[PDB]
Amino acid sequence: TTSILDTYPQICSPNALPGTPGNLTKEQEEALLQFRSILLEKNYKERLDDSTLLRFLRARKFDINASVEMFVETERWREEYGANTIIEDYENNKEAEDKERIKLAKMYPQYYHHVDKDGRPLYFEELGGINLKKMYKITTEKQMLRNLVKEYELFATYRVPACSRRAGYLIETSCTVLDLKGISLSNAYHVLSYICDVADISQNYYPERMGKFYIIHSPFGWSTMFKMVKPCLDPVTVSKIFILGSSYKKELLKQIPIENLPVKYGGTSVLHNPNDKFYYSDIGPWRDPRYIGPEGEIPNIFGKFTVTS
C-alpha cells in the first residue's frame, strides 16, 4: 500500500470520548467531510486522515471555520519551523543530539514506560532533580522546545502505530505522570515562560494529544504557582490535568495496570537489569517486533545508553 495508516486501526475504542474516530454523530461525520473538502480545495494533501482532522475539530468544538484556520496555521508553522524534517534532521546529526540528550537525562528524567489500561503510551517526567544553573549550561530554551517537537513527531510516527496495533483500536493520546517531588517553588516560578511556550506549541500545533495528565507529589503552595500557569492553558487542557493527593497511588491504579507502573509509583514494574536507570529507558509496544510496522523501529533517543527492557 505504502500507506502506513492502512497497517494499524484508525477507529478508537467504542468506549472513547465523543467526537473520536469511529464514535461520531451524523452531524460530526458531515463536519469531517466538509472540513476535508475545504482543505483539499485549498490544495492541502498531507495529514488529512480522520484522526488528524478530528483532533483539530474536537479542539474547536467542530467549528469548521475555526478548524480550517487552526489547520492552515499549523501547516505553516510545521514548514517554517522544520517540524516536517525534524526526525530526518535528527538522524543526520544523531551523534551530537544523542550526547546532549544524555547529559540532561539524569537531571530531568523523561521516559515512556508501557501503557495505561486503554493502551495509551505511559509517560513519566520527574522535575525535582532539575538544577537551573546547570541546565542553562547544557541546553537553551529553544533547544528544549525543539526536543519537545521532535518527540511529538516520534510519538505520531512510531508510538501511535505500535500502541494502536497492540490495543486493537486507534491510540491518539498519552497517559502522563508528572512527578513534582522535591521541586523548588522558586525554580517553578522562574520557568513560567517555558511552561507557557510548551502549552503554546502543544495546544496550537498538536491539538487533542493529551489523554490523562496526573500531577503527583506537588508541594505545599503549588496551587499558588499553578494559578500563574492556567491563563496559558485552554479549558480542555485544564480538564485533563488531575492533581493527586496523598492517595495518588490508588488513583494511578484506577488507570494503569499494576504490572506497568513503577514500584516507586505503586506498581510492580521493574527494569530487566536492576542497575539500569529509568531516565535512559524507552519501553513499550514500539520496541516489540510484533507491533512495529512499515514505519520501522523508533531511533534510540539515548544512543547506546538506551534501555529497552
Ligand SMILES: CCCCCCCCCCCCCCCCCCCC(=O)O[C@H](COC(=O)CCCCCCCCCCCCCC)COP(=O)(O)OCCN
Ligand atoms: C535552558 C533551560 C531553560 C528552560 C526552562 C525550563 C527548564 C526546565 C524544564 C522543566 C520546567 C517545566 C516542566 C513542565 C513542562 C510542561 C509539561 C511537560 C510535559 C508535557 O510535555 O506535557 C504536554 C504539555 O502540556 C501542558 O501544557 C501541560 C501543563 C502541565 C504543566 C504543569 C507545570 C509544572 C510545574 C512544575 C515545574 C517544576 C520546575 C522545576 C525547575 C502535554 O502532555 P502529554 O501527555 O501530551 O505529554 C506527553 C507526550 N509528549
